[PDB]
Amino acid sequence: HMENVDLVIDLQFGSTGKGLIAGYLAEKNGYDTVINANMPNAGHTYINAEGRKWMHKVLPNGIVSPNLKRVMLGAGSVFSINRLMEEIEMSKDLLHDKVAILIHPMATVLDEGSMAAMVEKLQRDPTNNTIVARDVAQYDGRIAQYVCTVEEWDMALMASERILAEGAQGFSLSLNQEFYPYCTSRDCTPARFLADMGIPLPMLNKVIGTARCHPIRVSGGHYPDQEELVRRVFSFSFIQMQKAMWTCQPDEVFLNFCNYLSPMGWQDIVHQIEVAAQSRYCDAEVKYLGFGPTFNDVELREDVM
């Protein structure tokens, strides 16, 4: 009942490719439940060993799990119903048989922007029955079939055997990190992600942090030990990693986009990530290395260095 959630988080500016490791872990570990709480975003990509591609803004990338039973969209979600229905249709083969999709009643429905909808939910206007999923489901049957009660949300988490939780955006984009106001509207930290998915703290088993060799901002400042090489590509920042390690405390790290650097380049970053971890009381080791955008391009660090 406890220690059964694996939480995937991005340790830099949100472009580390967390979707690749979510899909990879879902295929390897076969979680029965996959959960997230995304706000509108550019999409998270996973490509399997056969070349099928999923670009998701709403659904978790973990729906590729061979043991999938429950897909859960948390209270912190802010989503377009049109986009959700399109993503379900595109993966109807994975979602039609013995799979339950659950939308938390207090998830926010986007009016067919992100800020105004989140603000509308926070206003708590008693006569407004058009912002939270529980209320929209009373007149929009597209989501009435998936919206659950708070009690049903809790019971689905209790009934889950192994869960994959997928975090949002990235650590340095947090509302309360130093780049404010050039940041997102929430903190991008494990504690906020579990809060926004309604996951009790004892359920956390491990945190998998994702990083890139050259972080990208997709719009805000950068750390003093990095420089630029609408998208801005930066060199690796040790300070960024130290800050992310202290707060996020990952247990394992996936270092992606190693294919764009020389052997010295990506191996030096592997060692810097581990020095950053140790410097901030974190025992994380780099376990996975990404050398391309597909399942076939994820390698075990212990097998290549």
Task: Report residue 167: phi and psi, to 5°.
Answer: -75, 170
In angstroms, rounded to a whole number, what is the distance separating the alpha carbons of residues 133 and 135?
A: 5
Within 13 Å and on the Cβ side, how many CA atoms surround 124? 1
Q: Is 15 a catalytic residue?
A: yes
- Active-site choice (15, 65, 172, 237): 15
Return the DSSP state at 267.
H
Give how far Cα 160 sits from Cα of 29, 124, 145, 297, Å. 14, 31, 20, 30
In angstroms, rounded to a whole number, what is the distance separating the alpha carbons of residues 133 and 81?
A: 10
Q: Annotation-wise, does 259 bind a ligand? A: yes
Q: Annotation-wise, does 210 bind a ligand? A: no
In angstroms, rounded to a whole number, what is the distance separating the alpha carbons of residues 251 and 247?
A: 12
Q: Annotation-wise, does 231 bind a ligand? A: yes
- Domain region containing 275: 2-305
The answer to whether 103 and 153 are in contact (CB under 8 A) is no
Q: Annotation-wise, does 141 bind a ligand? A: no
Helix (H, G, I), strand (E, B) or coil at 141: helix
Q: Annotation-wise, does 142 bind a ligand? A: no
Task: Tell me the technique behind this structure.
Answer: X-ray
DSSP state letters, 95-121: HSSS-EEEE-TTPEEPP--HHHHHHHH
Number of H helices, E strands in the chain: 11, 15
Where helices occur in 112-189 by DSSP H, the ranges are: 114-123, 133-136, 141-144, 150-159
To one decimal, the resolution in angstroms is 1.3
Instruction: Note the residue count of the chain.
Output: 305
E strand or H helix that includes residue 275: helix 263-279
E strand or H helix that includes residue 7: strand 5-10
Nearest Cα residue to 296 out of 92, 46, 1, 40: 46
Q: How many domains does the chain have?
A: 1
A 10 A CB-CB count for 86 gives: 12
